A paper describes a structure:
Cyclophilin D (CypD) is unique as a mitochondrial cyclophilin and a key regulator of the mitochondrial permeability transition pore (mPTP), a transient channel on the inner mitochondrial membrane that opens under oxidative stress or high mitochondrial matrix calcium levels. A key structural feature shared among all cyclophilin isoforms is a shallow and highly conserved PPIase active site. Adjacent to the active site is the S2 pocket, a distinct exo-site that forms part of a long substrate-binding groove for peptides. In particular, three gatekeeper residues (positions 123, 124, and 145 in CypD) and one far S2 pocket residue (position 118 in CypD) are highly diverse among cyclophilins.
To further improve selectivity for CypD, we diversified the biphenyl ring of B2, which was positioned in our co-crystal structures near K118, S123 and R124 within CypD’s S2 pocket. We reasoned that establishing favorable interactions with these residues might further improve subtype selectivity. Collectively, these results suggest that carboxylate-containing biphenyl-substituted inhibitors gain CypD potency though a novel interaction that is both charge selective and hydrogen-bond dependent.
Numbering used by the authors: 45 to 207
Amino acid sequence: NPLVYLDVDANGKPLGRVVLELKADVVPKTAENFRALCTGEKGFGYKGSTFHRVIPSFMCQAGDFTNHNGTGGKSIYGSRFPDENFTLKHVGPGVLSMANAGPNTNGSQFFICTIKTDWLDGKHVVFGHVIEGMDVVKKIESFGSKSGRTSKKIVITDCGQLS
Ligand SMILES: Cc1cc(C(=O)O)ccc1-c1ccc(C[C@@H]2NC(=O)[C@]3(Cc4ccccc4)CCCN(C3)C(=O)/C=C/C(=O)NCC[C@@H](C(=O)NCCOCCN)NC(=O)Cc3ccccc3CNC2=O)cc1
């Protein structure tokens, strides 16, 4: 299971680092997409993009590096790739899962849960977990609102692979 990181700021002020373990032992294709989008090694990826939809007591969503609003993103494999499996569940805060627009629409957008989102089980592919920096996730959450609109611009200023 690779480890990756996101460094995040709010209106240009650093919030800190989120470290994520990707469950490549369960969803290796989904993990590999996210890993490569963190490193940028395919020529596109998360660096410079935002947490565009942040809803307290729900989740923090990011990864739309094409349209910055929840309508875009793409995978390293092409526009979409299928739901690899639904083996892992949305068991609590800190779960990392793929955003989608219905079956088999995984691209780049992802979310970090701030509550157990069990109503998403079987609908979104869970593929990793926060290992370090859950406090940074809670900081991101604090910059959200009910509609999802953020009170500050939340930017992934750097990201990459740790192991
Ligand atoms: C890469 C790709 C390729 C192809 C292809 O090549 O063909 C086609 C499509 C994609 C693709 C496109 C978009 C996404 C992200 C997805 N974009 C959206 O859907 C839209 C609509 C859209 C769909 C397709 C294309 C353009 C626009 C754009 C952004 C804002 N839109 C809609 C939303 O906000 C959606 C919210 C929503 O569905 N509301 C339901 C309730 C809510 C919940 O559980 N609420 C309960 C809260 O309780 C808390 C306790 N009280 N569920 C949720 O939020 C569900 C959810 C969960 C986690 C993360 C994201 C989402 C919503 N998905 C989005 O954001 C992803 C992939």
